[PDB]
Design a protein around this ligand. Structure first.
Ligand code: V7Y
Length: 835
């Protein structure tokens, strides 16, 4: 069909990679996967409700927190409903549905009308009490009135989906290696299963020539039958240093033992990270190192009661943290008493890490154990635990599948919380098709909000990671074929605008080097390029990728500008295309090159999780995880927080610092004394929040230039990629303390409170130690370009694993005192080392 080839062309532009391309593939797993993902696509497409899908209501089954109960008048909530002009405030109890409140309204075609939010693509619809809608909870947190506009439901017609159309020892021959351009070298051959080396053979050393030929059989001690599925033949070249690596799945996607002539182009090194695991080969055929190999070698098809001191010992092991490495003794015990270990869900990661995966007999027994998982099946979903099983330590389908099963019960609100980290977790899958990928796919097709971010998270990786672009593309394509016509058009708009505004960000950066500030003619160039794009190619309105509720429209070219930090990022402002919008405040977007934003995304997604945790223990520390989306290599977009400045500028209104300046800025920006005291309170929460959060994540030691505050006193850290690219545990400088009214070594009402909020928040995180450890662990492995055990075991020390709550109270309070004793020392030292 000529239609499908235009559609397939249409798809490739949205993805930024061609899945039909067969240049860098030596098997058809990628094609097999595309075929495979039709069934679950079409199933989910078929079973999804037209109406609710179109309106995509954002709701939660969670309780309303205490702090939001206290913000309510008298079991009564004021909703303001709008026509084309006039409006009426309605009194409503939190437990009313959108239908019930609609019935109550018309008293003052009833089922032909829906309560849309004013200024947003956000509907308050469906059998959910008004309190359970996220937009309502946002309004209640902020203390803003809840404004809606009655109008027609969106047409499901628009979400139309296009109809689609041997006991033999294993051995490998190393032929040799080959590269055009450039010591002693050898080829190391590893058989791995969940970064666990089963056997290793090293080829004899030879001179480091462009073409090194061996023609040698590396014979292993593992039988062919004993190879487990998802076993990777890891080939690495050495010289005391590792230079190149490549992987080959010894067992393929059809359960067949891999055989035949292979020539694999290798990835160069820039110990462990996600990129090391990829079955993909280097696409750059001209520069890269190749290796030639040959494979010829066949499908893969009443208990006595525990002692006290053993159950003790077992329960000890299971209780410990995920980074706690298991002794051989621990694993033998876990395995021997596996049927008892199966009764404890929190043993599972450890228990499956105790399996000999190089023994068909043991693997088979392992599988008999998973058949009797009534305990797991009935266990309350533990997300942290479920993540552990999807990390790099487990490369077994069945094991990994029980984790994915447990995720099925996640509400859409919770999926979003974890979606980024769950996309990154695909890097740990051994095969392109996997229960995880299908889960992602299914949940995105079910809910347009999840679908939207999924698009951007996959695309983020497709556009830079050569190690994983092929896999993510196939998954993305799969989603795009099911999301519907209204979304397709949305994404096309979005991607065009993004690519447009990237060119400008890059082109403007070419015009002025890091060496000097903004030029007049460069500003003149800027405002012409925008004039040009607005008039020529900018669409009338596009959806904001970091906040898909909001639709941005026409540029405020007057209000646009460019900074001078040598990064030279843009600062764009747009009118909101929605005329029903309550305010005329712009939509502020910052476009920047030269900064890796994948890091920022992950840190922020963790912040959002830390807030969700705190909500469960009746706490809100006014964190501000702004919108941020990596769009390509070193390029992304950032949400501009309105009425916000940096702590640095406040101080400069060389390297001299005054403690009071911060306090005076708040007095200046608050009209009323009450609003000053409200903002001083917001500062104490937000400071404590960011103090705790950054301490746990090992990123507290920032420069003032990297910290900001809103005019309403909401402090919030920024530029997290910068840190991950004489010390203090976190920024709690003398100015921050002067707001609280304490100076030197003293104490006051707000400082005594600050400390109450810190510890409470800190100990709340410790209640989810295991979750944060795994998210943090995973962040390092999938977020950073280059990671080690020493790094990962920081969070262990920062969360003070295996301790009482009072030693932890002590620890953190000591950390406060360290900040005070140092004062300005560290802030000062940046200027000193700069200059
Ligand atoms: C660092 C600061 N960041 C934010 O404002 C901010 C926000 N609002 N949301 N957000 C979310 C994540 C990260 N950052 C943020 C910031 C960014 C920026 C980005 C692009 C261009 C310019 C500019 C400019 C300009 C124009 N003419 N002249 C003389 C300077 C700027 C800029 O001036 N500032 C800045 C503001 C106040 C004091 C010091 C610097």
């Amino acid at each position: 069909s000529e239609e499908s080839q235009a559609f397939q062309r249409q798809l490739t532009a949205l993805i930024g990679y061609d899945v039909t391309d067969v240049s860098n593939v030596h098997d058809d797993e990628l094609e097999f996967t595309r075929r495979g993902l039709v069934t679950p696509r079409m199933a989910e497409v078929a079973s999804r409700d037209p109406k609710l899908y179109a309106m995509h209501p954002w709701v939660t089954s969670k309780p309303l927190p205490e702090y939001l109960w206290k913000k309510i008048a008298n079991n009564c909530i004021f909703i303001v409903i709008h026509r084309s002009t006039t409006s009426q405030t309605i009194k409503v109890s939190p437990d009313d549905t959108p239908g019930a409140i609609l019935q109550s309204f018309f008293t003052k075609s009833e089922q032909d009308f829906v309560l849309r939010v004013c200024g947003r693509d956000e509907y308050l619809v469906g059998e959910t009490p008004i309190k359970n809608f996220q937009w309502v909870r946002h309004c209640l947190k902020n203390g803003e009135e809840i404004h809606v506009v009655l109008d027609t439901p969106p047409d499901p017609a628009l979400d139309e989906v296009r109809k689609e159309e041997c006991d033999r020892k294993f051995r490998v021959k190393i032929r040799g290696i080959d590269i055009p351009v450039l010591l002693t070298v050898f080829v190391e051959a590893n058989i791995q299963h969940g970064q666990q080396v089963l056997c290793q053979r090293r080829t004899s050393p030879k001179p480091f020539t462009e073409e090194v030929l061996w023609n040698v059989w590396l014979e292993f001690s593992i039988k062919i039958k004993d190879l487990p599925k998802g076993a990777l033949l890891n080939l690495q070249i050495y010289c005391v240093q590792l230079l190149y690596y490549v992987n080959l799945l010894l067992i393929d996607h059809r359960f067949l033992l891999r055989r035949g002539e292979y020539v694999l182009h290798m990835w160069q090194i820039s110990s462990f990270n996600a990129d090391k695991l990829t079955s993909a080969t280097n696409p750059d055929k001209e520069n890269s190192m190749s290796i030639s190999i040959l494979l010829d070698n066949i499908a893969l098809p009443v208990r006595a009661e525990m002692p006290n001191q053993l159950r003790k010992q077992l329960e000890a092991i299971i209780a410990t943290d995920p980074l706690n490495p298991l002794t051989a003794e621990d694993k033998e015990l876990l395995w021997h008493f596996r049927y008892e270990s199966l009764k404890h869900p929190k043993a599972y990661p450890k228990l499956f890490s105790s399996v000999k995966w190089g023994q068909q007999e043991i693997v088979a027994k392992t599988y008999q154990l998973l058949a009797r998982r009534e305990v797991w099946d009935q266990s309350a979903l533990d997300v942290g635990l479920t993540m552990q099983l999807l990390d790099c330590n487990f490369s077994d389908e069945n094991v990994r599948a029980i984790a994915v099963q447990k995720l099925e019960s996640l509400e859409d609100d919770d999926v979003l919380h974890y979606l980024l980290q769950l996309v990154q977790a695909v890097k740990f899958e051994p095969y392109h098709d996997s229960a995880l990928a299908r889960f992602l796919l299914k949940r995105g097709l079910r809910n347009k909000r999840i679908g939207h971010f999924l698009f951007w998270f996959l695309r983020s990786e497709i556009a830079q990671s050569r190690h994983y672009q092929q896999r993510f593309a196939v998954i993305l394509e799969a989603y795009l074929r099911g999301c519907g016509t209204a979304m397709l058009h949305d994404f096309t708009q979005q991607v065009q605008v993004i690519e447009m505004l990237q060119k400008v960000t890059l082109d403007i950066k070419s015009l002025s080097a890091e060496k000097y500030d903004v030029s007049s003619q460069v500003i003149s160039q800027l405002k012409q390029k925008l004039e040009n794009l607005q008039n020529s190619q900018l669409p009338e309105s596009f959806r904001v990728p970091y906040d898909p509720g909001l639709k941005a429209g026409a540029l405020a070219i007057e209000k646009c500008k460019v900074m001078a930090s040598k990064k030279k990022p843009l600062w764009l402002e747009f009118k909101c295309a929605d005329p029903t919008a309550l305010s005329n405040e712009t939509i502020g977007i910052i476009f920047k090159h030269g900064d890796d934003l994948r890091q920022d995304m992950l840190i922020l997604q963790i912040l959002r999780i830390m807030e969700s945790i705190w909500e469960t223990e009746s706490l809100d520390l006014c964190l501000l995880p702004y919108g941020c989306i990596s769009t390509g290599d070193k390029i992304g977009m950032i949400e501009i927080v309105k009425d916000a400045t940096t702590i640095a500028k406040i101080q400069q209104s060389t390297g001299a610092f005054k403690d009071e300046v911060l306090n005076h800025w708040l007095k200046e920006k608050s009209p009323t004394e009450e609003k000053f005291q409200a903002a001083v309170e917001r500062f104490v929460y937000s400071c404590a929040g960011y103090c705790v959060a950054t301490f746990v994540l090992g990123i507290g030691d920032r420069h003032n230039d990297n910290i900001m505050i809103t005019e309403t006193g909401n402090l919030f850290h920024i530029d997290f990629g910068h840190i991950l690219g004489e010390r203090v545990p976190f920024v709690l400088t003398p100015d921050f303390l002067f707001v609280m009214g304490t100076s030197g070594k003293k104490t006051s009402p707000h400082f005594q409170k600050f400390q109450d909020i810190c510890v409470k928040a800190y100990l709340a995180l410790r209640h989810h130690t295991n979750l944060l450890i795994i998210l943090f662990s995973m962040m390092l492995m999938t977020g950073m370009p280059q990671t080690s055990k020493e790094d990962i075991e920081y969070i262990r020390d920062a969360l003070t694993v295996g301790k009482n709550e009072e030693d932890a109270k002590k620890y953190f309070l000591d950390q406060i005192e360290v900040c005070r004793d140092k004062g300005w020392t560290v802030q000062f030292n940046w200027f000193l080392h700069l200059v």
